[PDB]
Write a protein that binds this ligand. Structure first.
Ligand SMILES: NC(=O)[C@H]1O[C@@H](n2cnc3c(N)ncnc32)[C@H](O)[C@@H]1O
Lengths: 197, 240
């Protein structure tokens, strides 16, 4: 309800309608460049997750183009693009070109009001950790942008769970929910506690 | 530790703290030896039939003057109607400066409209060490993108320099080093170049050039046999 919450699930099959609405959605999808096909990505029920707010969508390779497609198909307009410059612990940067960075598209849906736009800049400089592990700095950027609001991360792993966030992913440990409105809708939809089909 | 928080506190962009921003000299030297003389043409590109630019090019660098650079301007409407496919060689490359706003999307539409697919996204990251805002922006915009596209069948995708003075629209000359180090061929075109961007090995075409020396026949004569397929990185082919 404020502390971390998470749901181990297959995001293709979970009825995300039970989760409510979120000021921010973030996703680091397993783009097909265990992956999800382009059609599975397109079919993800992102539209039900927000009325007015921002989407943060990590992309690479041909997903730079596919992710723009999904973003637009889901009803967002891309209004920014964050660049994570990858460094070692000494602040040195780690087909045609060697890659020093990863991209995170920022889409907007509806009319978000009361966000603190322009506090951070669109470049992150942070140390590489485990593989596909994105920097923790993004959570602080997102918190300053939209303090105290509900947020949801898709395809997150255990190290991704944070306060004010609900994390979904198939490598999390069980189900841990504290928001009673979410707890009630989850029990109504999944009385026996299983998410298949 | 957290350079984002530090930027909020002090105004020093995170990229201010990146540190350190062999036989490459020989390569640079071979590139210099095979470079054609600089050629340049004053042309008002909106009114100019680009088909008169021949032969077809191995490399096109496209630097349209976007409204966002100023805070005659070209909109993405104007840019998208350029006939770039008519002058690109069947196997060729493009480098398109897209800015930091809607160009990141509309520039990809251009690339696909002209027959290319994006193979690299080169980011020009601007430090503000010496001096520590679109309505749609969520964040402060501190970089620009140059998209690399290919059609047909050492360096990093980052350029880090200090942000230039207001009103200065020049792009970092480092983009030319990246392009020439790919050894993509010797027909290189720079659309919307300027007097200050004229460079050996390139044909520069732009509305603000004060002089021209371009002649299609003279230009084509640089690439006549035996020098039609050189990469721009090999020794020149000997004569008499
Ligand atoms: N960065 C990643 O790929 C993360 O997303 C997980 N994941 C891959 N497919 C799925 C899926 N259909 N549903 C939920 N989570 C998934 C991966 O197990 C990994 O935790």
């Amino acid at each position: 309800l404020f502390p971390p919450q998470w749901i181990c699930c297959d995001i293709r099959y979970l009825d995300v309608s039970i989760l409510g609405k979120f000021a921010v959605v973030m996703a680091d999808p397993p783009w097909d460049i265990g992956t999800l096909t382009d059609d599975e990505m397109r079919r993800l029920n992102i539209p039900v997750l927000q009325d007015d707010g921002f989407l943060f969508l990590w992309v690479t390779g041909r997903a730079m183009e596919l992710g723009r497609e999904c973003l637009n198909l889901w009803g967002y307009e891309r209004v920014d693009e964050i660049i994570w410059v990858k460094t070692n612990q000494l602040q040195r940067i780690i087909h045609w070109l060697n890659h020093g960075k990863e991209h995170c598209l920022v889409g907007v849906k509806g009319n978000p009001q009361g966000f603190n736009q322009g506090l951070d800049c669109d470049v992150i400089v942070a140390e590489v950790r485990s593989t596909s592990h994105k920097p923790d700095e993004i959570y602080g950027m997102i918190e300053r942008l939209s303090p105290g609001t509900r947020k949801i991360e898709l395809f997150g792993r255990p190290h991704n769970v944070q306060p004010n966030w609900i994390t979904l992913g198939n490598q999390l440990d069980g189900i841990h929910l504290l928001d009673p409105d979410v707890v009630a809708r989850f029990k109504q939809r999944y009385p026996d506690g299983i998410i298949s089909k | 530790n957290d350079y984002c928080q530090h930027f909020v506190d002090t105004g020093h962009r995170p990229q201010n703290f990146i540190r350190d921003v062999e036989l490459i000299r020989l390569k640079d030297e071979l590139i210099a030896k095979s470079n054609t003389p600089p050629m340049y043409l004053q042309a008002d590109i909106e009114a100019f039939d680009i088909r008169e630019l021949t032969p077809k090019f191995d490399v096109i660098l496209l630097e349209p003057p976007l409204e966002e650079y100023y805070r005659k301007c070209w909109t993405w409407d104007d840019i998208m109607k350029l006939e770039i496919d008519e002058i690109a060689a069947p196997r060729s490359f493009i480098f398109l400066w897209c800015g930091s706003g809607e160009g990141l999307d509309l520039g990809r539409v251009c690339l696909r409209k002209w027959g290319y697919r994006r193979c690299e996204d080169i980011c020009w990251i601007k430090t503000n060490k010496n001096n520590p805002l679109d309505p749609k922006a969520v964040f402060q915009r501190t970089k620009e993108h140059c998209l690399m596209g290919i059609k047909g069948t050492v360096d990093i995708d980052l350029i880090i320099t200090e942000e230039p003075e207001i009103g200065n629209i020049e792009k970092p000359v480092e983009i030319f080093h990246i392009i020439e180090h790919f050894c993509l061929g010797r027909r290189r075109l720079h659309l919307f170049g300027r007097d200050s961007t004229i460079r050996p090995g390139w044909l520069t075409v732009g509305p603000t050039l004060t002089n021209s020396n371009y002649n299609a026949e003279t230009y084509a004569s640089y690439f006549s046999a035996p020098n039609s397929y050189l990469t721009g990185c090999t020794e020149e082919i000997e004569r008499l």
